[PDB]
């Protein structure tokens, strides 16, 4: 066989220990899911410094807590825009997930509050910026560098899936790098509690699994497909399926064909063919052996999963850091004032926030 006695016993024990960890983690998540925290700070507790990113209904800013001097990232959502864009449920769900999860690669919610006009989530500040920027600048990551990040996503999805959470929003634009070079996942608007299947068309064209494109009921296997897209893009510098227009991307995704750069190792190509598998009865992460087909793949043979979780592996890349509050690794955005209206807006719909 592939393993002698000692290696087989060690692997078996490790896999049983994962089950034991996840059972405890689920119990802890379910307690917090049922008894969420709320109303833990206020706006005049913070100085607003700079915008780190924007979207159609909200922005994220670097802020400084006045009394302590500690920096945080504050997501500000305009209640009226959330309603207009049909994002009430996603917004409440994102906050509920963030309050209840606990894992070293998931961003921590430190405070949350609301006022007459806005909702506020105050999270850890992650000073290395988006993976996207580093990837486009460097061009591509070497296989060991890509593998270090991939391993963190594997563990994060193993954790989320054990809680019956599908993630659905994986891409380099949505992954931040911390001061130690490790990944932080921040965005949970598209995540959903799904023990079985779900049906919403959501995601980003390059990262959509075929079964989403084809309007099927789908399951957590879409996250394993997206992991394949991410690993490919990290290692190649471009994603496996691209074109001028989304429809042409979708035709490539559903085709069952993927091509690889000549510098990809055979181990990497094998892993990617098994993750980027159109046939759900064959996709790694969706078989009888679950996540173990991924974790035990040859491409991950050098990965010490516990050392990654414990953050004891030296990162391949440490972002520049001039000190607390340094925003050099984020883009510059037009700044806009935070207007708080004299009249409360949308109180009933956000009672749970």
């Amino acid at each position: 066989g592939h393993m002698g006695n000692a290696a087989a016993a060690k692997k078996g024990s490790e896999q049983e220990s994962v089950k034991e960890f996840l059972a405890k983690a689920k119990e802890e998540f379910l307690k917090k899911w049922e008894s969420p925290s709320q109303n833990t700070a206020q706006l005049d507790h913070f100085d607003r410094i700079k915008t780190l990113g924007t979207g159609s209904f909200g922005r994220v800013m670097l802020v400084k807590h006045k009394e302590t001097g500690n920096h945080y990232a504050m997501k500000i959502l305009d209640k009226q825009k959330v309603v207009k864009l049909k994002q009430i449920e996603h917004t409440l769900n994102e906050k509920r997930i963030l309050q209840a999860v606990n894992f070293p690669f998931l961003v921590k919610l430190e405070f949350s509050f609301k006022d007459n006009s806005n909702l506020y989530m105050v999270m850890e500040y992650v000073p290395g910026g988006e993976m996207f920027s580093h990837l486009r600048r460097i061009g591509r990551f070497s296989e060991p560098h890509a593998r270090f990040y991939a391993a963190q996503i594997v563990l994060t999805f193993e954790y989320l899936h054990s809680l019956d959470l599908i993630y659905r929003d994986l891409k380099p634009e949505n992954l931040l790098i911390d001061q130690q070079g490790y990944i932080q996942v921040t965005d949970f608007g598209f995540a959903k509690r799904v023990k079985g299947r779900t049906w919403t068309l959501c995601g980003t064209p390059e990262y959509l699994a075929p079964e989403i494109i084809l309007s099927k009921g789908y399951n957590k296997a879409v996250d394993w497909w997206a992991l394949g897209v991410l690993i490919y893009e990290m290692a190649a510098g471009y994603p496996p399926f691209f074109a001028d227009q989304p429809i042409q991307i979708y035709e490539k995704i559903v085709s069952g064909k993927v091509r690889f750069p000549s510098h990809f190792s055979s181990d990497l190509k094998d892993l990617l063919r098994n993750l980027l598998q159109v046939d759900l009865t064959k996709r790694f992460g969706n078989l009888k052996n679950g996540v173990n087909d991924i974790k035990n793949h040859k491409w991950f043979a050098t990965t010490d999963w516990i050392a990654i979780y414990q953050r004891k592996v030296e990162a391949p890349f440490i972002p520049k850091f001039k000190g607390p509050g340094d925003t050099s690794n984020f883009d510059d955005y037009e700044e806009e004032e935070i207007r708080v209206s004299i009249n409360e807006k949308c109180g009933k719909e956000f009672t749970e926030f």
Partner: peptide, 19 residues
Amino acid sequence: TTYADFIASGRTGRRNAIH
């Protein structure tokens, strides 16, 4: 090359989610 095709796609910047 494949890289040139990627540049030609116009989708090298941050990508939005659908709808």
